[PDB]
Amino acid sequence: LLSVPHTESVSLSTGSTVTIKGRPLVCFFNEPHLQVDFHTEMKEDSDIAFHFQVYFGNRVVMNSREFKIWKEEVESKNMPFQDGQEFELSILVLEDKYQVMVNGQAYYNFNHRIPVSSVKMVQVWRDISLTKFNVSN
Amino acid sequence: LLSVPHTESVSLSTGSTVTIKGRPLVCFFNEPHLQVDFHTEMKEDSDIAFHFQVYFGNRVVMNSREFKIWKEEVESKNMPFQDGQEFELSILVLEDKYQVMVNGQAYYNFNHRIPVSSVKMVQVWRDISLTKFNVSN
Numbered sequence: 001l002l003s004v005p006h007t008e009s010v011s012l013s014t015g016s017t018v019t020i021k022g023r024p025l026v027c028f029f030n031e032p033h034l035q036v037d038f039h040t041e042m043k044e045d046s047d048i049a050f051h052f053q054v055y056f057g058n059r060v061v062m063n064s065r066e067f068k069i070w071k072e073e074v075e076s077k078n079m080p081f082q083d084g085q086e087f088e089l090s091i092l093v094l095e096d097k098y099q100v101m102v103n104g105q106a107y108y109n110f111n112h113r114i115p116v117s118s119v120k121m122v123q124v125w126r127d128i129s130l131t132k133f134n135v136s137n
Numbered sequence: 138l139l140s141v142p143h144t145e146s147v148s149l150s151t152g153s154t155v156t157i158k159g160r161p162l163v164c165f166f167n168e169p170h171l172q173v174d175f176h177t178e179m180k181e182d183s184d185i186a187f188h189f190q191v192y193f194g195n196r197v198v199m200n201s202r203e204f205k206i207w208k209e210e211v212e213s214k215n216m217p218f219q220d221g222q223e224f225e226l227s228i229l230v231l232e233d234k235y236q237v238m239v240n241g242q243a244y245y246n247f248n249h250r251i252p253v254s255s256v257k258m259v260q261v262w263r264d265i266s267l268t269k270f271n272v273s274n
């Protein structure tokens with residue numbers, strides 16, 4: 001297992017992929033969460049270019065935190081995750097948006113609000129175990 | 138550190154105290170959560186006589202899950218928890234309600250919806266480290 005909360009320095013550009021493999025810690029019935037935050041600095045309270053929060057079995061919430069303020073919330077009811085199963089997230093950094101694949105198919109998209117070049121850290125946390133975290137070279 | 142998610146068999150009656158000492162895993166600014174669920178059986182998807190969920194720095198939500206259905210949600214804006222600090226929760230089982238103390242003072246109350254004698258398990262989970270879990274004898 002990798003450390004959770006998991007915090008890493010990153011550098012991203014168009015064409016980068018952030019791969020995350022993990023497993024929910026508890027039954028979906030109890031709504032475990034997963035959160036992935038693309039931050040502008042190493043500090044945890046720094047701004048967030050992409051906030052991706054899964055309410056397993058319920059919904060997905062996406063947003064940005066700009067100058068310490070949460071902006072317009074984006075919601076999805078797509079729930080391709082499977083109770084108890086390991087999942088593989090691939091967050092593709094496209095020219096216009098982040099695209100979040102689950103097990104190789106895109107389910108969530110978030111247009112860039114902050115330039116991708118401002119992202120310097122990614123934190124993965126909440127109710128998962130983590131077996132892989134990789135930023136493409 | 139104790140295991141988180143933390144799941145224990147319990148037996149409660151009027152006068153029992155459930156003591157929980159722990160620390161949030163991340164900055165309050167990012168809204169770590171704490172959840173404490175008093176269950177009717179050892180299985181995680183069993184009914185919940187008392188669901189206590191702290192959205193650190195934001196609010197507290199309380200409810201019951203009866204025959205697999207969430208009931209009427211109770212909210213509190215009391216937020217005595219301190220960013221980064223260890224806290225001590227004491228959940229007192231009173232005749233009429235659960236009373237949740239934080240560092241020795243009561244801030245939250247939840248009238249019994251299920252008999253206390255139906256509780257057989259307590260689970261403590263989400264974004265905390267756990268150093269103490271004790272049910273009074």
Ligand SMILES: OC[C@H]1O[C@@H](O[C@H]2[C@H](O)[C@@H](O)[C@H](O)O[C@@H]2CO)[C@H](O)[C@@H](O)[C@H]1O
Pocket residue numbers: 051053061062063070072073074167168195
């Ligand atoms: O939008 C991401 C942001 O949400 C905050 O909580 C929201 C919640 O998602 C929404 O349903 C509710 O109506 O309003 C809240 C805003 O106060 C979280 O506090 C924050 O951590 C992010 O998750």
Ligand SMILES: OC[C@H]1O[C@@H](O[C@H]2[C@H](O)[C@@H](O)[C@H](O)O[C@@H]2CO)[C@H](O)[C@@H](O)[C@H]1O
Pocket residue numbers: 030031058188190198199200207209210211
């Ligand atoms: O009430 C406890 C229950 O809440 C569910 O989520 C609620 C949420 O708190 C409320 O603000 C929103 O408006 O409605 C939701 C009900 O669908 C959680 O899903 C559940 O896990 C418990 O936390």
